[PDB]
DNA sequence: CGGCAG
DNA sequence: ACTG
DNA sequence: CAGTAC
DNA sequence: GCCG
């Protein structure tokens, strides 16, 4: 549409993120988007200014690529990016991180292996490195699920297990499987990790933990036979109070997500991963002082609803 | 000025 | 929410 | 707590 | 970086 921007902006939004200006970063996140959304190529500076989330600096450089036909700031970018992004890229390492290695004057994974202390939870990202850059096929999704369903309802047949994230918003290719588990009657969900995991482990299924919560697991799995790589997994036991919320958080996008609860924040409420308050009190610096009323949401629709919003279907969430 | 989701 |  | 991830 |  209008990549003949986007392309270029996209490596400088990078540039930004790998080397900590998070806003900055944002900001060039938000108007690649925008530039995602027109219909008609950009041809005035004002054109530009017209468009949400682009505004005078935004506006000049894609001037710039227009008429000069490149943009010039690509060429001062650090030697040091593509490094950190190489670092960034291990699960577990991020931004601070990959500046200290680079600073100690590591330049390479075979530096990182060989010299650099890793986490359990880095060297875990370390030997998966080029698996977890690779996205699947929705069908092993698919497999995978129902292996964490089978392993959970047979410990307890009521328990309720939903593939969320991408793979619930209707995707050709899931990045990792996030799966969400409760159990209708309000309370069977407690202490099923101990066992969940386990029997995933003895099969195989389960290779390496990364985080094991009372409420979140992640780790790494991988599907029996041959041709098959490792995968990263997501699993969320919730109370079923909470199911709807956590499902709408879970199903994303990310960038849904945060949309949404900045909408809230407008209306002098709050939505997160367990309820959509109400009357929540909040201070100097947009922060929540004191919390209010939790909402009722038995089901996502009423939190688009008390929301004043229009439903969208998991597959209209993918923003 | 200062938030940008929780 | 987790980790250390 | 800071860092990281979802 | 953008925007109220
Ligand atoms: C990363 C991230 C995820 N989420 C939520 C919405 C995501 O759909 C859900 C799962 O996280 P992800 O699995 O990281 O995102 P995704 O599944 O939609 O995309 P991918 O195919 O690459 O896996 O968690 C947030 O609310 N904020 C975040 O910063
Ligand atoms: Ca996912
Ligand atoms: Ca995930
Ligand atoms: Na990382
Ligand atoms: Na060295």
Same mark, same amino acid.
């Given at each position: 549409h209008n990549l003949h921007i986007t392309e270029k902006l996209e490596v400088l =939004?990078? =540039?930004?993120?790998?080397?900590?200006?998070?806003?900055?970063?944002?900001?060039?996140?938000? =108007? #690649? *988007?925008? @530039?995602?959304?027109?219909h008609k190529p950009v041809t005035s500076y004002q054109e530009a200014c017209s468009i949400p989330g682009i505004g005078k600096?935004?506006? %000049?450089? #894609? #001037?710039? &690529?227009?008429?000069?036909?490149?943009?010039?700031?690509?060429?001062? &970018?650090?030697?040091?990016?593509?490094?950190? +992004? @190489?670092?960034? *890229? &291990?699960?577990?390492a991020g931004t601070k991180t990959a500046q200290m290695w680079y600073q100690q004057g590591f330049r390479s994974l075979e530096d990182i292996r060989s010299q650099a202390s890793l986490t359990t939870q880095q060297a875990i990202g370390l030997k998966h490195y080029s698996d977890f850059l690779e996205r699947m096929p929705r069908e092993e999704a698919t497999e995978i699920e129902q292996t964490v369903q089978k392993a959970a309802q047979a410990f307890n047949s009521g328990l309720l297990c939903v593939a969320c994230g991408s793979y619930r918003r209707g995707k050709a290719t899931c990045g990792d499987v996030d799966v969400l588990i409760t159990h209708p009657d309000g309370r069977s969900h407690r202490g099923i990790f101990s066992r969940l995991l386990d029997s995933l482990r003895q099969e195989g299924f389960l290779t390496?933990? @990364?985080?094991?919560?009372?409420?979140?697991?992640?780790?790494? !799995?991988?599907?029996?036979?041959?041709? $098959? $790589?490792?995968? $990263?997994?997501?699993? &969320?036991?919730?109370?079923?109070? %909470?199911?709807? !919320? /956590?499902?709408?958080?879970?199903?994303?996008? /990310?960038?849904?997500? $945060?949309?949404?609860?900045?909408? /809230?924040?407008?209306?002098?409420?709050?939505?997160? +991963?367990?309820?959509?308050?109400? =009357?929540?009190?909040? *201070?100097?610096?947009?922060?929540?002082?004191?919390?209010?009323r939790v909402l009722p949401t038995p089901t996502e629709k009423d939190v688009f609803r008390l929301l004043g919003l229009p439903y969208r279907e998991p597959a209209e969430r993918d923003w």
């Amino acid at each position: 549409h209008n990549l003949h921007i986007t392309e270029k902006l996209e490596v400088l =939004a990078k =540039a930004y993120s790998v080397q900590g200006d998070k806003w900055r970063a944002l900001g060039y996140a938000k =108007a #690649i *988007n925008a @530039l995602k959304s027109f219909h008609k190529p950009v041809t005035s500076y004002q054109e530009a200014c017209s468009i949400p989330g682009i505004g005078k600096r935004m506006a %000049e450089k #894609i #001037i710039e &690529i227009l008429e000069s036909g490149h943009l010039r700031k690509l060429d001062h &970018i650090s030697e040091s990016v593509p490094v950190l +992004e @190489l670092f960034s *890229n &291990i699960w577990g390492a991020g931004t601070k991180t990959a500046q200290m290695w680079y600073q100690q004057g590591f330049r390479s994974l075979e530096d990182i292996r060989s010299q650099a202390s890793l986490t359990t939870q880095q060297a875990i990202g370390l030997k998966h490195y080029s698996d977890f850059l690779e996205r699947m096929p929705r069908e092993e999704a698919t497999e995978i699920e129902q292996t964490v369903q089978k392993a959970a309802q047979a410990f307890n047949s009521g328990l309720l297990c939903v593939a969320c994230g991408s793979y619930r918003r209707g995707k050709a290719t899931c990045g990792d499987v996030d799966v969400l588990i409760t159990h209708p009657d309000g309370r069977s969900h407690r202490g099923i990790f101990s066992r969940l995991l386990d029997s995933l482990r003895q099969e195989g299924f389960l290779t390496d933990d @990364l985080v094991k919560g009372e409420t979140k697991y992640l780790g790494v !799995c991988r599907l029996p036979g041959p041709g $098959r $790589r490792h995968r $990263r997994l997501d699993i &969320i036991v919730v109370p079923y109070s %909470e199911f709807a !919320c /956590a499902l709408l958080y879970f199903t994303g996008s /990310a960038h849904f997500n $945060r949309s949404m609860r900045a909408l /809230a924040k407008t209306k002098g409420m709050s939505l997160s +991963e367990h309820a959509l308050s109400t =009357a929540v009190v909040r *201070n100097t610096h947009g922060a929540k002082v004191g919390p209010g009323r939790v909402l009722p949401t038995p089901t996502e629709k009423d939190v688009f609803r008390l929301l004043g919003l229009p439903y969208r279907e998991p597959a209209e969430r993918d923003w």
